[PDB]
């Protein structure tokens, strides 16, 4: 989804962070545009430093970035991710 980070499920926001971390944009500006959007969506004060200059005591990975954002938003009373389909039960 597109307006808010709360329009993305956690899986969809992780796919977005994965994409930035792969650094495969055809030009730098293509990936810079993803980074600016990441800063807009997270609203996190550290901005791109979460991606490129991570704190040593969590994991330097797209999953680590997504966890630190999740926890900061929860801690700060901001809306979190959209609920996904992970909890749905299939019959057998």
């Amino acid at each position: 989804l597109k307006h808010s980070i709360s329009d993305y499920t956690e899986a969809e926001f992780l796919e977005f962070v994965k994409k930035i971390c792969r650094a495969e944009g055809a030009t730098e500006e293509d990936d810079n545009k993803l980074v600016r959007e990441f800063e807009r969506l997270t609203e996190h004060p550290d901005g791109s430093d979460l991606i490129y200059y991570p704190r040593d005591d969590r994991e330097d990975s797209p999953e680590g970035i997504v966890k630190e954002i999740k926890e900061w938003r929860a801690a700060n009373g901001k809306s979190g991710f959209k609920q996904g389909l992970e909890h749905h039960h299939h019959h057998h």
């Binding site: 930035i20 971390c21 792969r22 650094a23 495969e24 730098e28 990936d31 810079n32 980074v35 600016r36 550290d46 901005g47 791109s48 430093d49 991606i51 490129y52 200059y53 991570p54 330097d60 990975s61």
Partner: protein
């Protein structure tokens, strides 16, 4: 325009230690490391953007420079993209470290002269050119 012509890298870099881009936000910025310049010297580049891409690739191959970047920045330099500067050192629309010519190209500073090239933060490249 002069950055769009081909040329050959010449000149000597400088000794660099374990805090290479700590210099990039001060004075004229950080030097090309001397062992990097050794690897690029007398190679032909099609334009300055070619040199820039090959420069960051060379940095990626130097374990003592590579270790100064975290994982996403290491991925960028292996792909020949410039690394991102720290958020405090960026300018709107200018997030990555920039190559600056100490004697400017407009002042006949050498485009591929590796004694003349510096790695700067976006804030510092701007502040060099407005006399700060």
């Amino acid at each position: 325009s002069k950055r769009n012509k081909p040329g050959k890298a010449t000149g000597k870099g400088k000794p660099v230690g374990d805090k290479w881009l700590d210099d990039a936000g001060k004075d004229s910025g950080a030097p090309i490391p001397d062992r990097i310049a050794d690897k690029l010297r007398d190679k032909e580049f099609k334009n300055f953007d070619d040199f820039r891409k090959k420069f960051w690739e060379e940095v990626s191959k130097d374990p003592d420079l590579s270790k100064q970047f975290k994982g996403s920045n290491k991925t960028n330099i292996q792909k020949g993209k410039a690394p991102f500067a720290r958020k405090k050192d960026q300018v709107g629309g200018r997030e990555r470290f920039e190559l600056h010519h100490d004697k400017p190209i407009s002042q006949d500073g050498g485009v591929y002269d590796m004694n003349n090239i510096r790695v700067t933060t976006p804030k510092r490249h701007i502040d060099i050119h407005r006399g700060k």
